Specification:
The chain has 215 residues and is α+β, with helices and mostly antiparallel strands. The two termini are 30 Å apart. It has helices spanning 14-24, 32-54, 89-98, 103-113, 190-199; strands spanning 6-10, 67-72, 77-82, 135-143, 150-154, 159-164, 173-180, 208-210. Keywords: ATP-binding, Chaperone, Cytoplasm, Nucleotide-binding, Stress response. Homodimer.
Length: 215
């Protein structure tokens, strides 16, 4: 018998107002979820890369500095793994739900007025939550050098889960898994995504690797 503890946290309120608004945004152009997936993971690699210069040890947990994208049609899932700085348990609680940003209020406000477009989400510091434009439930694994590997889970409810992760070990970094929704499955099409990635890679300084999973 396997045993693990699952801690259950409750989302801040306007960052749950955000997930609500996002999952009902009948937006035609959702492809910025991937735009944000790449950027976030690029910013992560920058944090461990700039820490490299001032302390060479930080890379010892995982030498490779790259991004992997993993479309799985059978599992109905899109995975994006980076080998950046990664989050601790505290960093996941803080950065991923509980604490609100100040541009959560301002983003939703001008999304409704029309001043901001949904593709402008990343400029309000909440680019992450765009993952819910194409996914019903989002799961984040992370491994910072200062903590054990932890897994985050949310189906966009008022609620999220955190727990010590005993799945595929990451040396260091973040693995965000998108459990795609039926009407967005054409985003798992090999060519559709390939092209879409390289379209939103034209400014990325890191090696990207697209691993297409097959039946």
């Amino acid at each position: 018998m396997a045993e693990s503890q699952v801690e259950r946290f409750t989302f801040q309120a306007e960052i749950n107002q955000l997930m609500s608004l996002i999952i009902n945004t009948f937006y035609s152009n959702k492809e910025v979820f991937l735009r944000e997936l790449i950027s976030n993971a690029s910013d992560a690699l920058d944090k461990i890369r700039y820490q490299s210069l001032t302390d060479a040890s930080v890379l010892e947990s995982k030498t490779e500095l790259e991004i992997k994208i993993i479309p799985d049609k059978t599992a109905k899932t899109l995975t994006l793994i980076d080998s950046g700085i990664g989050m601790t348990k505290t960093d996941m609680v803080k950065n991923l739900g509980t604490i609100a940003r100040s541009g959560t209020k301002n983003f939703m406000e001008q999304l409704q007025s029309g001043a901001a477009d949904i593709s402008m989400i990343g400029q309000f510091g909440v680019g992450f939550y765009s993952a819910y434009l194409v996914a019903d439930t989002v799961i984040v694994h992370s491994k910072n050098n200062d903590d054990e590997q932890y897994v985050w889970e949310s189906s966009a409810g008022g609620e999220f889960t955190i727990a010590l992760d005993h799945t595929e070990p990451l040396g260091r970094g973040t693995k965000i898994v998108l459990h795609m929704k039926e009407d967005q499955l054409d985003y798992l099409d090999e060519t559709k995504i390939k092209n879409l990635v390289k379209k939103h890679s034209e400014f990325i300084q890191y090696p990207i690797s697209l691993l297409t999973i097959k039946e």
